[PDB]
Design a protein around this ligand. Structure first.
Ligand code: HEM
Ligand code: HEM
Ligand code: JSS
Ligand code: JSS
Ligand code: H4B
Ligand code: H4B
Ligand code: ZN
Lengths: 411, 407
């Protein structure tokens, strides 16, 4: 079956055959679409077929499908599975696997870069202190004094599900949130819970509006342990505006390195529950979501007062006006300090080129329109007008429950 | 069976049971989501009628009463004899209100039960259609105090005697391809404009020429008609801060009136059913004015604003977008023509959803369409999970008649 997608701005039609490979479920049915729903121990039995499918993919990618080396690898993995109930990936397979999980991430607009990904193999790691060291090196390499480089660090795979490696942080770098008795929140409201957990684990909170959180690291199923990332390793950018001199007095800053640390990486049926990865920001992530969401820093009102906008009625579009200014400020501040950032116009234009290329060379590109279209100025970006098909390919990045919900405390 | 939808900003969770009454297919499968694809007999007619009549009689709390069963036998008999049937006026009104209620891509549904239904099922000619349409336009415009309305022409018979309005909307602006190779006026209507000209329309060849109506009655060739200009309320576009805004030469019409869709009630097909409401400001200010394949005025406006157009990262397009949208709303408000901004419309829609979940067990909603084409995440709908499914009665798309009609 061939499926077509059309761009309604350019009339370009593309043909997807790749979706035929898709194994997993979407959440939708012939009678209901769950396209806007945010979230819609493996055995020997299920494991070899997952391993085979992955090695067939890997050996096709290197143009050695059906070779002796291909056949020998299948038998060796099969034998390792019957012997030990699991198997170990080669370095090369691990690299290919991690790159492909990114290549397959349908909610990621930054995928044009998928094949430049620095893979750090941390599968010899045994302790939380070892994790902290691996994570510091990742941050330093990825930050690169502002010239950001994509990277992922891969800790040991799940075994019985009782010995998981986890990074308890949702991102490697984030700011604390503190609920006051009067119901107001100081810092980032998204991190209130995680911040309480840290404090309870013995973190001494400085209790300001931008306190970088400590790392909370679990190795081999043990109780997690706290670490402060060295501050010379945390690149931050004070936010100012190219025309509004008062913008700086809002006291805003943000960190330069977006690094997601709470996803599960699946490769050939193996589960990597700690696999922190990082790229660089698209401006709207900070300026639209982090600063302007009502449940986040929520600065729209304050910024609009300072611009003296008419706030008596929504139809003055004061919210929209202040929103664009904050986003100019974010981009300007990053560019002036030579910290890599991409604006939403440029990122979306690159994505369309990436998608066309993927359709030609790969037979498709799974994409989640709800997520790809930026949270401001939707239809002035070319992705708004692009039909997309969403489907699940492996290797993949998946969500997993927050560890404080599942962890067995040892004391 | 029971499905939950969460709002991530407010933590409100709703439970959807209404989806279980869906019959039509979505285009998705368990292996693929098509949520962003724009277009994904006697025997057939009776279950359809029975399903419609059951929901009707239940809506007036007479499910399974004497009247209910009686109507079912009467429709059954008429189907058995004539191969079709006729809706009672009450059913036609209910079916139209519900097709709007069920329109998953419409953010304006809080208003669904206040719809004026004009029954035009006695119409026989294009001149008659023209009269009904003018009456619809004058009624709906109401000197700027807009009122929602639908006019419903005779249902389909053999499919060779279709009533059709060939316009996509009752009121739209002409578009002309030029020697230069550029486009004057609205490029979305270049083809339609040409069909009007090959029908003998004398085009003023301007940037805002109201198109004639092209009306097909009973399967015949369509005929041209000019709407009386005094019936077409228009708004000159000016800006509350920027004096120079007036000089761009911009205006828009007050009445949004979709005229190319098909209304399905009880298995009966109404191929001509123009309906109208009132604008959300972004439809004009973001889509009509700023789409690259439309009026595409971004470059011009950013110019008058002396913005830095060197690099995309100065957000010049975004700054200009906002001003333009302020201007559209300001103009309509100053002229007392009903309009709603995207903030107010999406807040009403969240309220409507809450109403529908408690009263009806759900609300079918297409997030890709409900979320405004600007400032998405600062509107509450962005943070609202929605379930999309197809309920009947419904509005459906149909082929452009010029690809189908036999001249
Ligand atoms: C190189 C620059 C990159 C840019 C500009 C970028 C852009 C983005 C953006 C804007 C999102 C949406 C996140 C949200 O709104 O919550 C996203 C999601 C995602 N990206 Fe990227 N990305 C980049 C690199 C990467 C890398 C290196 C990986 C992994 C190797 C990755 C994998 C993912 C995944 C798995 C998601 C889904 C997150 C979720 O569902 O919560 N991306 N990307
Ligand atoms: C009265 C105020 C109304 C507002 C503010 C409103 C708002 C909108 C908007 C913004 C769209 C999306 C159109 C697009 O982006 O192309 C839409 C679509 C739609 N609306 Fe409404 N609406 C209103 C009344 C109505 C009425 C009276 C009906 C019919 C009785 C209706 C039925 C529909 C349908 C069927 C669609 C989908 C059309 C398509 O797919 O092209 N709406 N509405
Ligand atoms: C690698 C990378 C590069 C980049 N530019 N941006 C990113 C996403 C990060 C940063 N800016 C947002 C954050 O995204 C990670 C969290 N994403 C939403 C998680 C979520 C919450 C609730 C329900 C769900 F289903 C999912 C990663
Ligand atoms: C009744 C009403 C009120 C309102 N405020 N707004 C409206 C939508 C009108 C106005 N502003 C746009 C137009 O919408 C009608 C055309 N809609 C898209 C047609 C289409 C093309 C190609 C593929 C598709 F799947 C669909 C109706
Ligand atoms: C309900 C809705 O699906 C949810 O708010 C989504 C919408 N699109 C998104 N898109 C991105 N990139 N990130 C998000 O967090 C969301 N949130
Ligand atoms: C490809 C994509 O589905 C298409 O551009 C859609 C997206 N969302 C939309 N939303 C509305 N309200 N109107 C539209 O025309 C569209 N276009
Ligand atoms: Zn779907």
């Amino acid at each position: 079956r061939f499926l077509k997608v059309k761009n309604w701005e350019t009339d370009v039609v593309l043909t997807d055959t790749l979706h035929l490979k898709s194994t997993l479920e979407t959440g939708c049915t012939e009678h209901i679409c769950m396209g806007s729903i945010m979230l819609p121990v493996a055995t020997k039995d299920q494991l070899f077929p997952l391993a085979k499918e992955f090695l067939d993919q890997y050996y096709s990618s290197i143009k050695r499908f059906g070779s002796k080396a291909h056949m020998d690898r299948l038998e060796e993995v099969n034998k390792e599975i019957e012997s030990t109930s699991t198997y170990q990936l080669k370095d090369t397979e691990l690299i290919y696997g991690a790159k492909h999980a990114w290549r397959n991430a349908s909610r990621c607009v930054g995928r044009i870069q998928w094949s430049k990904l620095q893979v750090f193999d941390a599968r010899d790691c045994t302790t939380a202190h070892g994790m902290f060291n691996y994570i510091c090196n990742h941050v330093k390499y990825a930050t690169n004094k502002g010239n950001l480089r994509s990277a992922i660090t891969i800790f040991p795979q799940r075994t019985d599900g009782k010995h998981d490696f986890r990074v308890w942080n949702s991102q490697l770098i984030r700011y604390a949130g503190y609920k006051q008795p009067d119901g107001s929140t100081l810092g980032d409201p998204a991190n209130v819970q995680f911040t309480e957990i840290c404090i309870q684990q013995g973190w001494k909170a400085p209790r300001g509006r931008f306190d970088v959180l400590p790392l909370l690291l679990q190795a081999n199923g043990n109780d997690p342990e706290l670490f402060q990332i060295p501050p010379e390793l945390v690149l931050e950018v004070p936010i100012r505006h190219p025309k509004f001199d008062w913008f700086k007095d809002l006291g805003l800053k943000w960190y330069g390195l977006p690094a997601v640390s709470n996803m599960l990486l699946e490769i050939g049926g193996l589960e990597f529950s700690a696999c922190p990865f990082s790229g660089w920001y698209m401006g709207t992530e900070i300026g639209v979501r982090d600063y302007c969401d009502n449940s986040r820093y929520n600065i729209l009102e304050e910024v609009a007062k300072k611009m003296d906008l008419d706030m008596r009625k929504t139809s003055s579009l004061w919210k929209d006006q202040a929103l664009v200014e904050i986003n100019i400020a974010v981009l300007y501040s990053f560019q002036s300090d030579k910290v890599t950032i991409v604006d939403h116009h440029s990122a979306t234009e690159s994505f369309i080129k990436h998608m066309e290329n993927e359709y030609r060379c790969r037979g498709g590109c799974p994409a989640d329109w709800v997520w790809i279209v930026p949270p401001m100025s939707g239809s002035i970006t070319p992705v708004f007008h692009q039909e997309m098909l969403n489907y699940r390919l492996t290797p993949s990045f998946e969500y997993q429950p927050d560890p404080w919900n599942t962890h067995v405390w040892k004391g």
